[PDB]
Amino acid sequence: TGTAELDALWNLVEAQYPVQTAAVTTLVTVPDDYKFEADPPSYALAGYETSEIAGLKFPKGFKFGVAGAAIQVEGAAKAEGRGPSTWDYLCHHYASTQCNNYDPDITTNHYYLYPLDFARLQHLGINTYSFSISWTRIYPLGAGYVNEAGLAHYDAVIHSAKKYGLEPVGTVFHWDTPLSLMLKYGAWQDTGDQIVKDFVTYATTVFKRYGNEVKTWFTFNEPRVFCSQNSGLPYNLTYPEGINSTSAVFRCTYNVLKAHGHAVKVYRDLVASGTIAAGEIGFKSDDNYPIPARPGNADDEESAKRHEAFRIGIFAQPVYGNGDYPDVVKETVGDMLPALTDEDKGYIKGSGDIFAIDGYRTDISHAALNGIANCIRNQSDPNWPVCEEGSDPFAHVYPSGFAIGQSADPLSSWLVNSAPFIRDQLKFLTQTYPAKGGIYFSEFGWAEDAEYDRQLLYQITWDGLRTQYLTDYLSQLLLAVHKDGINLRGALTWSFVDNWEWGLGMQQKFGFQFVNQSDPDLTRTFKLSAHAYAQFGRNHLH
């Protein structure tokens, strides 16, 4: 049951409709005479940068970069021995209900186009490329046999990136759970510890393979967001005895923390044995400490604390703090979240060299209107377990009725331009979750208003709100370094391309380049925001 089981799994994934194949299935050669599209006019970036950041530079060695993830950009879902993820299965069986009639078969075809992508990032003065490794390219069944062609693919991607002057930053796991492990024992809902062994075997292989060339690592991308998806399809089809939709989240939380700790131990041992280069390893946190709706009101103060504990604290306190879950989380979820043993704390405590925040926005916290005490006691309460008002007319709105900032578009309504709150977030995170190597802004970006292929190219490429958000956000990071003394190591924008955005597929556009999904070649065009990003780097790096 090797390539034999691989076939079986793809046959199960493809029962209703097959994996589609890209128009281009060969590594692209950047041609000798390749012409970038002309620059926008000279006045186009006028008015974006304020005089307040005149003369401010990021520290020496600042990582000024872009971020993508394997399943969101690569395509080639079955190429060169790749096994299926939970998402391959979800989008081929539940496309209309869970996947917005898209699938990750092809996405941006970055699997074959990366050389061309890197020549275009080099044109913009980008100096860092954040990627994820597809677990099922390396172990198509999550455990057992190794796919050499997959290990060779990322060698070639890392080598290309360095030639184009992009420092490679690697993420081991960006939500693409191997389907085989889900079917065998329920993957991250495993009540045993085989998920931890299988993850650690995988992390060991990619660290040995790449960590002479990759010296900044993230084990997990946004583990809090990933564990919340384990409450639904396709994970809820395979729960072990004792797991339901509520407990699966907290089972996943604990297994991810274990996987992380054990993986960072192998990373440090490989460094200590001289097998790889001395580098830095952490994981990507997300979300925010919200502002209370009514300053000095203890209920809104409490609900904002509960938000931070469940969205950030539940992973960051064990790793960068006192080595245990927030007491607020323990008191609320009880036995559903397995106790960290002395042995667990042995690996997890101190297992972050660097902090990384996906600092997209900051929220407002209104205490649950039915009362924090009532909400805590009822797991069926829609606001459980944070027990603030979680919906859009509360999360983003002052008591005044006015928003915290610009909204992104109803499909991405969690996203606001909240640049003025960035310094407070960084101050909180570096004091509460201190790391020796400091802190990354590891993801930030805009899903732009009209552009959802409503349009002609000239309307798409002048992306004023994206350009505003990225300049806002970069400006505030500069001031964090210069006014708050933040040890900020980098800024990585999501993303360098419109890509496949999970349940929303290619309808959500996060790129500073447009990808033409009606063109066989999936041709990239720079938006104004890509030139805004380039111009900010030339002006504020050195």
Ligand X SMILES: *[C@@H]1O[C@H](CO)[C@@H](O[C@@H]2O[C@H](CO)[C@@H](O)[C@H](O)[C@H]2NC(C)=O)[C@H](O)[C@H]1NC(C)=O
Site for a copy of itself in 422-451 (CB under 8 A): 449-450
Scored b (16 or more CB within 10 A) or e, 5-43 reads bbeebbeebbeeeebeebebeeeeeeeeeeeeeeebeee
Nearer CB in complex with a copy of itself: 364/426: 364
Other Cβ atoms within 10 Å of 443 Cβ, number = 23
Whether residue 513 contacts residue 530, with contact meaning beta carbons closer than 8 Å, is answered with yes
Which of a copy of itself, Ca ion, ligand X, none does residue 37 bind (CB under 5 to 8 Å by kind)? a copy of itself
450 Cβ neighbours under 8 A, 6+ residues apart: 459
Here's the x/- map for a copy of itself, 39-58, by CB under 8 A: it reads as xxx-xx-xx--xx-------
Nearer CB in complex with a copy of itself: 417/507: 417
Q: Which of 17, 34, 36, 47 binds Ca ion (CB under 5 A)?
A: 47
Which of ligand X, Ca ion, a copy of itself, none does residue 518 bind (CB under 5 to 8 Å by kind)? ligand X
Shortest distance (Å) from residue 273 CB to Ca ion = 52
496 Cβ neighbours under 8 A, 6+ residues apart: 66, 67, 68, 117, 121, 126, 511, 512, 513
Site for ligand X in 247-266 (CB under 6 A): 247
Is 222 annotated as catalytic?
yes
CA distance between the termini of the chain: 55
Q: Is residue 379 part of the contact set for ligand X (CB under 6 A)?
A: yes
Q: Which of 378, 398, 420, 485 binds ligand X (CB under 6 A)?
A: 378
158 Cβ neighbours under 8 A, 6+ residues apart: 168, 210, 213, 214
CA 470, CA 474: separation in Å to the nearest integer?
A: 6
Which of ligand X, Ca ion, a copy of itself, none does residue 44 bind (CB under 5 to 8 Å by kind)? a copy of itself
CA 367, CA 19: separation in Å to the nearest integer?
A: 46
Q: Sort 242 into a burial class: Cβ within 10 Å, 0-12 / 13-18 / 19+.
A: exposed
Whether residue 328 contacts residue 305, with contact meaning beta carbons closer than 8 Å, is answered with yes
Is the peptide bond between 234 and the residue preceding it cis, with omega within 30 degrees of 0? yes
What region does 394 belong to: left with phi over 0, alpha with psi -120 to 50, or beta?
alpha
Nearer CB in complex with Ca ion: 130/468: 468
Is 47 among the annotated ligand-binding positions? yes
Indicate the length of the chain as a whole number: 542
Q: Which residues pair with 220 in a beta bridge?
A: 173
CA 240, CA 183: separation in Å to the nearest integer?
A: 10
Please report where in the chains the tokens 């609900």 appear, as a residue.
303
Q: Is residue 233 part of the contact set for ligand X (CB under 6 A)?
A: yes
Tell me the Cα Rg of the chain: 22
Backbone angles phi, psi at 477, to 5 degrees: -65, -40
Nearer CB in complex with Ca ion: 45/486: 45
Listed ranges 138-146, 199-207, 269-277, 460-468: which one lies at the site for a copy of itself (CB under 8 A): 460-468
Q: Is residue 409 part of the contact set for a copy of itself (CB under 8 A)?
A: yes
Q: Is residue 297 part of the contact set for ligand X (CB under 6 A)?
A: no
Site for ligand X in 72-101 (CB under 6 A): 94, 97-98
Q: Is residue 420 part of the contact set for Ca ion (CB under 5 A)?
A: no
Catalytic residue among 167, 222, 389, 448: 222
Nearer CB in complex with a copy of itself: 16/400: 400
Q: Which of 244, 406, 432, 487 binds ligand X (CB under 6 A)?
A: 244
Q: Which of 455, 485, 538, 542 binds a copy of itself (CB under 8 A)?
A: 455
Q: Which residues pair with 221 in a beta bridge?
A: 284
Shortest distance (Å) from residue 410 CB to ligand X = 12
Q: Is residue 336 part of the contact set for ligand X (CB under 6 A)?
A: yes
Whether residue 159 contacts residue 166, with contact meaning beta carbons closer than 8 Å, is answered with no
Q: Is residue 300 part of the contact set for a copy of itself (CB under 8 A)?
A: no
Listed ranges 6-14, 281-289, 325-333, 401-409: which one lies at the site for a copy of itself (CB under 8 A): 401-409
Listed ranges 20-28, 53-61, 215-223, 334-342: which one lies at the site for ligand X (CB under 6 A): 334-342
356 Cβ neighbours under 8 A, 6+ residues apart: 218, 282, 283, 284, 285, 439, 440, 442
Q: Is residue 26 part of the contact set for ligand X (CB under 6 A)?
A: no
Binding site for a copy of itself (CB under 8 A): 37-41, 43-44, 46-47, 50-51, 392-393, 396-398, 400-407, 409-410, 413, 417, 420, 449-450, 454-459, 461-462, 464-465, 468, 472
Instruction: List the binding residues for Ca(2+).
Output: 47
Q: Which residues belong to the active site? A: 222
Binding site for ligand X (CB under 6 A): 94, 97-98, 232-233, 236-237, 244-247, 334-336, 374, 378-382, 456-457, 460, 516, 518-519
